[PDB]
Amino acid sequence: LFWDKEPWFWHDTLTEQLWRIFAGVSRFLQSISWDPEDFEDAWKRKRLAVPCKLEKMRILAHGELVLATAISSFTRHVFTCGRRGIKVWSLTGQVAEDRFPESHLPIQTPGAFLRTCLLSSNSRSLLTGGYNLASVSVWDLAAPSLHVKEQLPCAGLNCQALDANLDANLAFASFTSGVVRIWDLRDQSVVRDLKGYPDGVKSIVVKGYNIWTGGPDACLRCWDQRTIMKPLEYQFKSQIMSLSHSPQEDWVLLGMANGQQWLQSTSGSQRHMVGQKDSVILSVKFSPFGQWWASVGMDDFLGVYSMPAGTKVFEVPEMSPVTCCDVSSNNRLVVTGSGEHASVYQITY
Amino acid sequence: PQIRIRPWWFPVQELRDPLVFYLEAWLADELFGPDRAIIPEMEWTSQALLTVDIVDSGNLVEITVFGRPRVQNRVKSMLLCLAWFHREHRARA
Amino acid sequence: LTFSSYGLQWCLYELDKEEFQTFKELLKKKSSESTTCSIPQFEIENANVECLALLLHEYYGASLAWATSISIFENMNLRTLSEKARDDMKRHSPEDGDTWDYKSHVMTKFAEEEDVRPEMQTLAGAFDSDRWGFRPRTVVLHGKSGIGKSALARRIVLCWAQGGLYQGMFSYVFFLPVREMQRKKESSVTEFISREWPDSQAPVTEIMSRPERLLFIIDGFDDLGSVLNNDTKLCKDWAEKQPPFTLIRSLLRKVLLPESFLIVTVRDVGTEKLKSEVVSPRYLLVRAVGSLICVALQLQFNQTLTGLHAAFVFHQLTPRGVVRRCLNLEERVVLKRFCRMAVEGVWNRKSVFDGDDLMVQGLGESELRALFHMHLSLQDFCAALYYVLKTKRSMELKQAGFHIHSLWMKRFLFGLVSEDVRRPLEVLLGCPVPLGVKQKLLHWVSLLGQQPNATTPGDTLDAFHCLFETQDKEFVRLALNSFQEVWLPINQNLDLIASSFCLQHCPYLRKIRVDVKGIFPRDESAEACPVVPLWMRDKTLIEEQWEDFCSMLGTHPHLRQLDLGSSILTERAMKTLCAKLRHPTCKIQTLMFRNAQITPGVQHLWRIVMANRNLRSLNLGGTHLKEEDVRMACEALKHPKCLLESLRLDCCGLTHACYLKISQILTTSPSLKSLSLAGNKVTDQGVMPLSDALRVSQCALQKLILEDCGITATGCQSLASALVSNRSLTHLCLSNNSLGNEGVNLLCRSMRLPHCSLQRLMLNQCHLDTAGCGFLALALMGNSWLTHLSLSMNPVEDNGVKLLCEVMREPSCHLQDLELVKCHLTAACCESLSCVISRSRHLKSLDLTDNALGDGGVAALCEGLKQKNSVLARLGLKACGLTSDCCEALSLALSCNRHLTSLNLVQNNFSPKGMMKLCSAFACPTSNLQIIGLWKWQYPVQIRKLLEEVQLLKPRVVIDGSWHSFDEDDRYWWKN
């Protein structure tokens, strides 16, 4: 949109000409393609190939700073999050830039915000929570009208990260008081509670019977639900900004806020460099097929990297610093958010 | 005129150009059941909204699909295959 | 039963064709191992995804079928689809006085206002609760324009007054019409409540006692969205006085009187504009086009609806009781005024006109009534007519630029340049009507045609629709002339009609592909449809239309290549397609069926190759061939009249007897000069018969491809004997086979003779090593025929490349092209290759990808290419890990060199200074690089404009990141 000198559609020209006449006074941008057959990309001379292309295809205007983004692919929507509420967009129509959301989700309570969001892997629930709020709410997206179906009680606590695991019906949370709780969606009763670190944990990731967390103290810990044993501590040099766990193999990918990335394996304590940058990374996300990962930073650049060794395929520039990203489940679409806008790209290989 | 609810996720742009085809009343009732409680789940999985109506005579029953045309043809083929299976099953018994 | 199968089919419809075949094979193995329940193999092989899922449920059982499919999904290394299947199974598998006076006064008022100018059951539940557990306050209604929203609202409030609806929920009903609120610039809620009462005074305390007692029925929210375009602060207090639009906004937002509840009636665009404010609503859907078309038909140009509308409109416009009367000047002026009003209505997205606007226009009511009899279609047609006969920039442009409702206007606009529709207008008016629209329309379509990329499928389909509407042969011929090749999906019968009509008049067509699915009628057997009549079941119109499209495909004069990007062809479909290709008038050279699914009708494909004389190529793939089919192929090839010069079989899963028959036809058929067998299981027992056929001196083969055949050393020695005996073959490819050093050595021994006539051989993924490279180098000395070679993706270290360079340093060698990728290379090989480039005099290409060449390697190759003697044409660098200094050195070398033409650099990290250096070097007049591989958008704006400036000089230069552009066709067509 901005990158081109001017974005234009095929019918735009005819409409402009007819308007000019009435008042008496590649080149053509394309729309996203959904069907899998129409991709028609020849074999290089469901898949594990490494992508080799990008192109912007829309911009989304929210009106205020953007803190978290999510992209559903089973349904086409997208979710943006700001201090005053959440806005739901759509991607079906064709427009250069969007201004009329699909629905607004406001909160009326003095000194009440939101700071985080998270979507279920089935695209059926949406966790929301923030400062000075009564509880963590879950929205029922499968229903013909948005409405909270449950509440997770919490008093005098601020949530700074969320997560879930639908196989066992467990919902997780992290609070600024260094307290990590749990719940059960059947009964909504706290099952356990892990505490002892006032610095707290900025990011938590759940997979199987382990819970990996990290924070400003520059340490990574592992907890197990079954027992009450103490965690396993790993030592690093800088702070940790985000984590993601490969779905295929045993690796944990994180950013160190000094332009470095490291991989950690559960089986044994092994590490190795996979990238270097002059900026500070603010997020890292893993592809649904574990062959590549995306990384959005602070020095106005979006990067894509290759899993086997860590070499970078390419990157795209932007105007404002980015703070979030999210890769679709199709492995095709990747969303990012900077400033007061949320843009959409496409991947072809 | 007929009045119906629409979910909040199915876009309104897709309501253009619907598709319709008729079937036997008894076969339709067996396929969906008298209550038709399953329609919401099928819709959520298929990103497509259905609508079952019974003609006055009670002999032919219409079904409907909304969504992109390829989705329409896909669902039509699925329904006709299931209908043939049910027809042969009845014929055997 | 059906409920779970539906989800299962949707699980199996994410599977690719090859994945689908692999799933079928695994299932067949599982079933064969099973004795409890047996499943026939032919049924499995003949079944499609839907049939597969239904049968898998039928034999195994719901839970067991889900479990088996999940297990196989896990076996194929498909995790995500497995999780989706598990969750969908979890969700699909079942468990195992004053008030009376007010209401009466309101009823009189609404009866008077309606006099001046089934659904109850659903409306009654509009406030109840659903299964999730929810009670809605706000309800939005929308639908087509035929229904009168005010009529619905007044009927609902009347029924409420009668007491049969919402008797127990609320007692006060308020009707807010937006027009009236707009009439008055200033208003307040208390003012409205006082006004609605007859006495003009109401108890504010009683009204505001409870929120439940109230209700508000807004109407026509879309009428004034122009006022709502303004943005204002919302008012918390209800006693204040503010503009009406602010009150409506604050009441919809629920910031004022939150406990109360609303309801809204609105049009489609209105629900597009208001969806952003209403909080957690419950939308609904409501549903004179048919009546209007029926009336027009009864009051009768059947080819298009634009013609019918024009005919009806001109019938209406004719003076009553007088025929063939030229309109008076005042009549024409009033017509123009009416058309301008309609066009303003379309542009401003308002379907309602108050008498004030009519007075501003000035046209009389009687004349307007006489001119029109009955709708959005009429307004659109009137806008078209206007086009046939404000601020500098306004938002109404972009608003109407959504082309969601202007589609009809353009469709009509294209329909009026038809002469059959033009002539009645000319005689009715009696004056010439020159129109500059035609030029703009022709230029529009021609601008579409000129796009460098193959036309987008949707754009092409819509262009076909519009042009087919035009119905002018010379117009289409002038428009379609621009382009050469088209890409055209076919989704619906009308798509077939448009595609058939609009292509007969294309004079420069060469290539075309069609993705056809869902069009083919349900088979008369096992798909009987009571709704469809007898004609639809058999001899349907779709059959005739597909036959006519096939005839057009056959009869084109300039068509050569036909392809099917994807399709589910029926046996009848392929029979009909082949019927129209046996005609000698056909001129198509090539074919393609690799991605399609055409298995039932493959046997029909052989008759055409036997009969037609101009067919030159034939490509199959992924299909399944039986022994009888291969025998038929042999017999068809055995006809003396055939001139086919290429065949390609793939993954057909042939049998030993099939290889024997193929060898016999190879030795007997003189026309066939190529053959490919990739993905077939051709063991050494399949290699020996082919070698025996090759031994004879009559064999006329020149190319041969053998991919994933998994041959061994015995095949290697068989081929060695055949090659020493044979004297005809030229191209051979053995890739992805585990030959090893012994096979390399055997072939090398066979090739050391001076009478060998091989020109191109490639061995990829062959498990070579240093020893194999030594053997090849040894056999390379004393030969001058072989000209190409490629050893990619083998762990040939530096030493092997060193040996090859030592052999190639001689003046007698005639090797021209050499490519090697992923060979674990370093700087020493680069020193050797720089020596070779500086000295050699026949090497014309090279490739080094995924090799950690680094700064030293690039510096060595630069010192090589600096020389003026070198004749290297194209070089390949990628993923070699470059930096700034190496890019500086490369830029200097490119400044010095004069023979290098092509190049490539991607997957590298260049600093902005380095990119500056590279562009400056590309700028030099001396260098002439006709291709460069780079991504423009990957850089800041400064770099993009710099590279564009470089692109301006030397307009021949091409900067495209994706290499393999302008590369000869043979290099990649041979390999496959």
Curated annotation (Swiss-Prot), chain A:
One of the record's GO cellular component terms: nucleus
Top-level lineage group: Eukaryota
Keywords annotated in UniProt: Cytoplasm, Disease variant, Nucleus, Phosphoprotein, Repeat, Transcription, Transcription regulation, WD repeat
Record note on what altering E318K does: In OZEMA15; uncertain significance
WD repeats: 61-99, 109-149, 154-193, 196-233, 235-274, 276-315, 317-348
Signal peptide start-end: none
Statement: the UniProt record of this protein carries the keyword Nucleus: yes
Gene Ontology molecular function, alphabetical: structural constituent of cytoplasmic lattice; transcription corepressor activity
Compartment(s): Cytoplasm; Nucleus
Positions carrying Phosphoserine: S287
Effect after changing R115H: In OZEMA15; uncertain significance
GO biological process: actin filament organization; embryonic process involved in female pregnancy; endoplasmic reticulum localization; epigenetic programming in the zygotic pronuclei; establishment of spindle localization; flagellated sperm motility; mitochondrion localization; negative regulation of canonical Wnt signaling pathway
Impact after mutating R186Q: In OZEMA15; uncertain significance
Domain notes: Contrary to other WD repeat Groucho/TLE family members, does not contain any identifiable Q, GP, CcN or SP domains. Only the C-terminal WD-repeat domain is conserved.
Disease: Oocyte/zygote/embryo maturation arrest 15: A rare cause of female primary infertility. In affected women, ovulation proceeds normally and the retrieved oocytes appear normal, but zygote formation and division are severely impaired. Inheritance is autosomal recessive.
Protein's job: Component of the subcortical maternal complex (SCMC), a multiprotein complex that plays a key role in early embryonic development. The SCMC complex is a structural constituent of cytoplasmic lattices, which consist in fibrous structures found in the cytoplasm of oocytes and preimplantation embryos. They are required to store maternal proteins critical for embryonic development, such as proteins that control epigenetic reprogramming of the preimplantation embryo, and prevent their degradation or activation.
Swiss-Prot record, chain B:
Effect of R6G: Found in female infertility with early embryonic arrest; uncertain significance
Single GO BP term: regulation of cell division
GO cellular component, one term: protein-containing complex
Superkingdom of origin organism: Eukaryota
Occurrences of domain KH (ranges): 18-79
Swiss-Prot/TrEMBL keywords: Cytoplasm, Nucleus
Statement: the UniProt record of this protein carries the keyword Nucleus: yes
Main location: cytoplasm
Subunit structure: Component of the subcortical maternal complex (SCMC), at least composed of NLRP5, KHDC3L, OOEP, and TLE6 isoform 1. Within the complex, interacts with NLRP5, KHDC3L and TLE6 isoform 1. As part of the SCMC interacts with the SCMC-associated protein NLRP4F. The SCMC may facilitate translocation of its components between the nuclear and cytoplasmic compartments. Forms a scaffold complex with KHDC3L/FILIA, and interacts with BLM and TRIM25 at DNA replication forks.
Protein name: Oocyte-expressed protein homolog
UniProt organism field: Homo sapiens (Human)
Gene: OOEP
Shown residues within the full chain: 32 to 124 of 149
UniProtKB/Swiss-Prot annotation, chain C:
Coiled-coil regions listed: none
Result for mutant: S669T: In OZEMA19; uncertain significance
Oligomeric and partner information: Component of the subcortical maternal complex (SCMC), at least composed of NLRP5, KHDC3, OOEP, and TLE6 isoform 1. Within the complex, interacts with OOEP, KHDC3L and TLE6. The SCMC may facilitate translocation of its components between the nuclear and cytoplasmic compartments. As part of the SCMC interacts with the SCMC-associated protein ZBED3. As part of the SCMC interacts with the SCMC-associated protein CFL1/Cofilin-1. Interacts with PRKCE. Interacts with TUBB3 at cytoskeleton microtubules.
Gene: NLRP5
SMART domains membership: LRR_RI, PYRIN
Family to which the UniProt record says this protein belongs: Belongs to the NLRP family.
Outcome following mutation: G362V: Found in a patient with Beckwith-Wiedemann syndrome and multi-locus imprinting disturbance; uncertain significance
Domain of life, source organism: Eukaryota
This protein's UniProt keywords: ATP-binding, Cytoplasm, Cytoplasmic vesicle, Disease variant, Golgi apparatus, Leucine-rich repeat, Mitochondrion, Nucleotide-binding, Nucleus, Repeat
InterPro entries: DAPIN, DEATH-like_dom_sf, Leu-rich_rpt, LRR_dom_sf, NACHT_NTPase, NLRP_HD2, NLRP_innate_immun_reg, NOD1/2_WH
Compartment annotation: Cytoplasm; Cytoplasmic vesicle, Secretory vesicle, Cortical granule; Mitochondrion; Nucleus, Nucleolus
Effect of substituting G146E: In OZEMA19; uncertain significance
GO CC list: cell cortex; cortical granule; cytoplasm; cytoplasmic lattice; cytosol; Golgi apparatus; intracellular membrane-bounded organelle; mitochondrion
Compositionally biased intervals (Basic and acidic residues): 85-95
Every Pyrin domain range: 1-91
Domain NACHT: 137-389
Disulfide bonds: none
Protein name, entry field: NACHT, LRR and PYD domains-containing protein 5
Residue sites binding ATP per the record: G143, K144, S145, G146, I147, G148, K149, S150
UniProt-reported outcome of changing T883I: In OZEMA19; uncertain significance
GO molecular function, a single term: ATP binding
Entry comment on modification after translation: Phosphorylated by PRKCE.
Effect of mutating C550R: Found in a patient with Silver-Russell syndrome and multi-locus imprinting disturbance; uncertain significance
SUPFAM superfamilies: DEATH domain, P-loop containing nucleoside triphosphate hydrolases, RNI-like
